[PDB]
Subunit: 273 residues, 3 copies
Amino acid sequence: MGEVVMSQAIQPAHATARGELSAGQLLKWIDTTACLAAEKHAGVSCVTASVDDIQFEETARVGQVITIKAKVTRAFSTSMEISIKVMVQDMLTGIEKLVSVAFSTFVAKPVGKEKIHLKPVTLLTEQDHVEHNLAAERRKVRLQHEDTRGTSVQSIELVLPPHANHHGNTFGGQIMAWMETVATISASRLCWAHPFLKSVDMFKFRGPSTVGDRLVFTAIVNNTFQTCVEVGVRVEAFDCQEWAEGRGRHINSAFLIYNAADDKENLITFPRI
Amino acid sequence: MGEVVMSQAIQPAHATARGELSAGQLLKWIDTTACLAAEKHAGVSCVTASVDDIQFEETARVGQVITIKAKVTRAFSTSMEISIKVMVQDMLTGIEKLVSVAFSTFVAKPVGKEKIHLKPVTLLTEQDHVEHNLAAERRKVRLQHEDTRGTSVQSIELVLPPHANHHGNTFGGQIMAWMETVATISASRLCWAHPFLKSVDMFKFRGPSTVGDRLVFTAIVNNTFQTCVEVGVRVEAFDCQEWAEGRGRHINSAFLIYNAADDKENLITFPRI
Amino acid sequence: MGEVVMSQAIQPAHATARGELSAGQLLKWIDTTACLAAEKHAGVSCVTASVDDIQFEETARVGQVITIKAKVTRAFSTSMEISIKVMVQDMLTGIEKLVSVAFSTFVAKPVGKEKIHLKPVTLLTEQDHVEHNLAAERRKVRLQHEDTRGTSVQSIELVLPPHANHHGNTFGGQIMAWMETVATISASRLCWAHPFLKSVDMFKFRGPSTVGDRLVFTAIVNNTFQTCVEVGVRVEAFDCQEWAEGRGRHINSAFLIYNAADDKENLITFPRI
Ligand SMILES: CC(C)(COP(=O)(O)OP(=O)(O)OC[C@H]1O[C@@H](n2cnc3c(N)ncnc32)[C@H](O)[C@@H]1OP(=O)(O)O)[C@@H](O)C(=O)NCCC(=O)NCCS
Ligand SMILES: CC(C)(COP(=O)(O)OP(=O)(O)OC[C@H]1O[C@@H](n2cnc3c(N)ncnc32)[C@H](O)[C@@H]1OP(=O)(O)O)[C@@H](O)C(=O)NCCC(=O)NCCS
Ligand SMILES: CC(C)(COP(=O)(O)OP(=O)(O)OC[C@H]1O[C@@H](n2cnc3c(N)ncnc32)[C@H](O)[C@@H]1OP(=O)(O)O)[C@@H](O)C(=O)NCCC(=O)NCCS
């Protein structure tokens, strides 16, 4: 019913040192599902234009099953809004818990110089009309949002073919995964404990990336508050030539909020800064 | 001696939540080895045409070493039959156990409009002639075989470059791996325990897949019997356009038989359906 | 300051059966960082020409963070020398330990028939001049170095797009990773315990490899001495046609020295051979 459904069993390969699902991996999965919904509407390849605020109510563990459902709520001109629901199920108890509810914005790409005009989302249920109207306000918010200490972390990732679509365009989800890895390192470096992602703030993907180009990641704590730490990550891009000349492209800047727990499952308080 | 040998140490990255080798990973490895044997005979790229019945006598664990040997038993016109032997060795005891003995059929692909004629397999030992004759009967069987409850699982995989050969053709082994993941989720969802793969029934790859296209996987228990559960998986393919229009290609349908164990190493009985 | 910095948290996906970082993975990371430094100097794609001796003072564990820093010490004509420093940090204690200090030689590749002339490394500090001079001697040594029992291991790897750069050239680091896997299997097969990499001897990458070609790996113990075992690995390459005809290309031959520990953290002595 307009939904794209992905199901993933959580393996050690998706895990952190604690037997928990890497938040970056989950973000990758989410972006993939959403992108598939978008492309299912568009009929052409789509890329992650932006992401709204994402909060995680639960942290999934190895052995559990993640279910991700994405849907196109509304098409505009070249962009569209995707609603995402993430559920976790324990396979010993049978219990389902909501992990996340979020929105992401995807943009349809032409092959060449094709203009692109998206057909409208067909509406049936009343809730379809409701979400169809809310999509406009949420979009307005998204657009207006573009009104815009030595424990730093630096990292670098080379963009290979499995990190982009078949046209060569880097996945926003991969970037989000790498981002999350680096940020987590920063948080850990502040608390010397075990950080788990509480949320990611809304941000835009400002420019495209391509296979073969370098992504420099710069993470640093921006603020702290009781049990929450905020890490800001910057993603800058260079093709080989740009890499040689030091002139990069600001791909994106995001803010990730973490909690943390020690080597016992008890929560901890971050120092003030 | 016509054999292709692969050796793989089993790491957490190849593991399930139980420290056992993912059956899908093993299937990937098997298909790869077999394909390498086939291409070693053909001199051109080959794809997985079909797979005979595969039974697993053992389940390998993290720390153990898998050895896979493949061989071309007989070439026909464009296809050939590959015999596969899978052994596991424990690296603390030195003990080897047979994991599997199976056959797979591979088809040589031309580059363009080239006709393809395969040279015969050279025969030395008598057992080479024996298997060369048996290959005909086994083939006859393969060809004749094409005479052809709410715990469902749905999943989706985007086919990226590491999932296909350099011409863009999706590996049958990758499809088998994904299949296995989804199916395992279904079985778990029936028993709420820990399923391990007992076997896979013979099936054909009905059509090609290509980088960039979506594979929709649909798993559902078809039957049960004492300690065995049967999960059927369907694999449907869509390029982006087909994805938009809902017209897919039936790539394949397979049937996987599992057992299961609880959080103790004791076997369990599945309910009747 | 001419440095390229990569930071990697160590996950189960990077781990062995013992919760330690795979040496091959570390080698991959090292080669990547170094290559990025090289390309940052050259402005074009670079490949691993050779590697000096690498010794590992520590073995990192899951949960710890690897930091790798690479730098171009000196450019010659088409080649350049890269100095690499590998540090590990425990994220519970905050303690850093040096893992490695090594040198690698990278070669700039033209796109077509372009001649390639590298600009000199700018020198500031005195240590920059010192290393700039030492680079010549170390190079002289590298060039002169090209003056050149049944527990064998054989394995095979198909080179896919994630294993090469965007021009199709296989990464030396991937080859080093595969090498290490196979070698480790050999060592384990000698001691029936848990080998960890002590060092790798300097070796040259004699020829290029390309996406789609097979890498046959042959590992075998060459010698033993008290607590050290030496495993030699050979890497031979075949495109599909070459694969069919049995005429390969000797890509490289390396020698890896291991120690080992039993299922207690106590070191062990290898038998004489
Ligand atoms: C997304 C992108 C195309 C928009 O760029 P732009 O400078 O804002 O140009 P436009 O104003 O014409 O925007 C075009 C569309 O993107 C939408 N858009 C722009 N900013 C947005 C935001 N912050 N949130 C949601 N949608 C946004 C616009 O509404 C417009 O949609 P419409 O045609 O249906 O009206 C461009 O920024 C981009 O290519 N970003 C990177 C996309 C990408 O490749 N991501 C993968 C990871 S690199
Ligand atoms: C395999 C395939 C080429 C055969 O298609 P087809 O409609 O049966 O056409 P053909 O009858 O001419 O079959 C050609 C060859 O495949 C063989 N073949 C067909 N069905 C087979 C089966 N079920 N089992 C074993 N071999 C089979 C035929 O014997 C024939 O071999 P030959 O030339 O040596 O006599 C085609 O079905 C296909 O492309 N499948 C997908 C292959 C693939 O890309 N797999 C990767 C995963 S998508
Ligand atoms: C590296 C390579 C280009 C040199 O080949 P060659 O037969 O020695 O030819 P050359 O003598 O002209 O060497 C060219 C450069 O490589 C350097 N070089 C050669 N052997 C070297 C070695 N053992 N160690 C360090 N540098 C070396 C030379 O000094 C020369 O550098 P310069 O132009 O700045 O003076 C060639 O061997 C090759 O392509 N190897 C594989 C590279 C690769 O693709 N690696 C990825 C894994 S396959």
